[PDB]
């Protein structure tokens, strides 16, 4: 057996599957042949510069001037470099497909302007947090990167509806969109997104200033697979009923922190949800009737979570463990009216179901820790 007998193309392809740490701190120190192979810039392509103890700035411009053969750039964390490095990297990499840079709260909108201006083939853009992200820097991406597919703007409080509607007008291929705690973004953005981009599959407006009037417009998206509506302003039961009725491709529905979803709504969703696979109802003011309906009527739900639901009892879990054939994960987190000995009996006499309470998850973590025990 000899690895070096393989052609250099195969070895480069193998090294491409190694992280930057594992390649620079181990692979480059095996022998001079692997050193010369990993030193090559040709087959770098996707580069992950996440965190990196924030150790780069001028090196960003160095590697930008080095190679143009970059399709995905990950700049998560690492607050060291400024907008100039991002600008020159966008100048040097037009063939960029995926852009990722979470929690870079020092990057302004000049970076995203240069990005939109110097790489239109973008498909995935994840810019979580990062304050000073105005809509005027966002309409650049909305009008220039029409080939966009995935977009993430998590906790970017400096975004209103203008940039969102501009993004919705263009980028007809947008299959994913996620926004969290983004105020100033209301029903208008949701409506303009739902009626302009039928390619939408993943959508989420957690904590945004969205009401049922904007949520009901998602029925025009028969390709919706996952919907995230956690801690959202006043979502009546009828709206999500119509959502589950029309969007037949709905797989994951997230309704956490909605104090008005009742058990009749869960029953309607379980009945008319022929493709529903994951349902999250944390803090939803329901009762055991919701779980009983999920068990008796839905033959497709695998993951159901009723965490912090006050009125859930032992029977509500026992009946759904008996009557649900597709159930494999039960979210019984902080249901204080549930006895723990009952949950122990359930986990002992019900296989393929991972009952998740406080003590059960703590016990799983404690076993994973006792594998390397201490005291």
């Amino acid at each position: 057996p000899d690895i070096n007998q393989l052609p250099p193309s195969i070895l480069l392809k193998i090294f491409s599957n190694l992280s930057l740490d594992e390649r620079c701190l181990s692979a480059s120190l095996v022998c001079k042949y692997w050193r010369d192979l990993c030193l090559d810039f040709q087959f770098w392509k996707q580069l992950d510069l996440s965190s990196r103890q924030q150790v780069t700035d001028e090196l960003l411009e160095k590697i930008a001037s080095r190679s143009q053969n970059i399709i995905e750039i990950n700049i998560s964390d690492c607050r060291s470099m400024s907008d100039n490095g991002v600008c020159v990297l966008a100048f040097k990499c037009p063939g960029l497909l995926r852009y990722t840079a979470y929690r870079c709260k020092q990057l302004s909108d000049t970076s995203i302007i240069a990005v939109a201006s110097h790489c239109p083939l973008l498909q995935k853009v994840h810019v979580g947090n990062q304050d000073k992200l105005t809509d005027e820097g966002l309409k650049q991406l909305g009008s220039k990167c029409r080939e966009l597919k995935d977009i993430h703007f998590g906790q970017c409080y400096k975004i209103s509806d203008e940039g969102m509607i501009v993004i919705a007008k263009g980028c007809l291929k947008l299959q994913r969109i996620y926004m969290q705690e983004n105020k100033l973004v209301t029903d208008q953005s949701v409506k303009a997104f739902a009626e302009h981009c039928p390619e939408l599959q993943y959508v989420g407006f957690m904590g945004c200033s969205v009401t049922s009037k904007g949520v009901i417009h998602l029925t025009k998206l028969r390709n919706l697979s996952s919907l995230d509506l956690r801690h959202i302003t006043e979502l009546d039961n009828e709206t999500v009923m119509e959502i589950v009725k029309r969007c037949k491709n709905l797989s994951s529905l997230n309704l956490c922190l909605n104090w008005i979803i009742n058990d009749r709504c869960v029953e309607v969703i379980a009945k008319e949800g022929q493709n529903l696979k994951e349902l999250y109802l944390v803090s939803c003011k329901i009762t055991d009737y919701a779980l009983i309906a999920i068990g008796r009527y839905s033959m497709t739900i695998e993951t159901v979570d009723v965490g912090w639901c006050k009125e859930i009892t032992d029977q509500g879990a026992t009946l759904i463990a008996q009557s649900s054939k597709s159930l494999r994960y039960l979210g019984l987190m902080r249901c204080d009216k549930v006895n723990e000995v009952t949950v122990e009996q359930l986990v002992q006499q019900y296989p393929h179901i991972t009952f998740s309470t406080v003590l059960q998850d703590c016990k799983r973590t404690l076993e994973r820790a006792y594998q390397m025990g201490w005291t």
Binding site: R230, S283, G307, E340, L359, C362, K363, T365, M372
Partner: protein
């Protein structure tokens, strides 16, 4: 002066060993980057289970539907890192302590994360400061 509040429940054994595990910096899957005005981007590491067992908002934020990569980074704003640290200490040890001038910030954080026990405690403390 200084106020404090201690609670005893069913997790008297699990919470302590989970706190020791947290102090060991071992098994962790949640990273909180707290930022507040001009305070540094404080970085805490913790388990999803302990944070979800004491606050429904943390549980809702941890049910994102896909946790393949294990470690998740959750940036938190509007709260001072010391307040968040005291909240995590209560979540892990069922006991919290604060200065007589930091009761309001602790109560704000607890109301933001719906921790009823320390909310009532801080309410009683703010009433007793009159």
């Amino acid at each position: 002066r200084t106020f404090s509040y201690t609670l005893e429940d069913h997790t008297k054994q699990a919470a302590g060993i989970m706190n020791e595990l947290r102090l060991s910096q071992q098994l962790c899957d949640v990273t909180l980057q707290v930022k507040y005005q001009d305070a540094p981007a404080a970085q805490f590491m913790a388990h999803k289970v302990v944070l979800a067992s004491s606050s429904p908002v943390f549980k809702a934020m941890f049910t994102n539907g896909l946790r393949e990569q294990g470690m998740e980074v959750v940036s938190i704003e509007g709260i001072h890192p010391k307040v968040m640290e005291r909240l995590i200490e209560f979540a892990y040890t069922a006991s919290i302590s604060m200065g007589e001038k930091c009761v309001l910030h602790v109560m704000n954080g607890a109301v933001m994360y719906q921790i009823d026990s320390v909310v009532r405690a801080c309410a009683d403390f703010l009433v007793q400061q009159l």
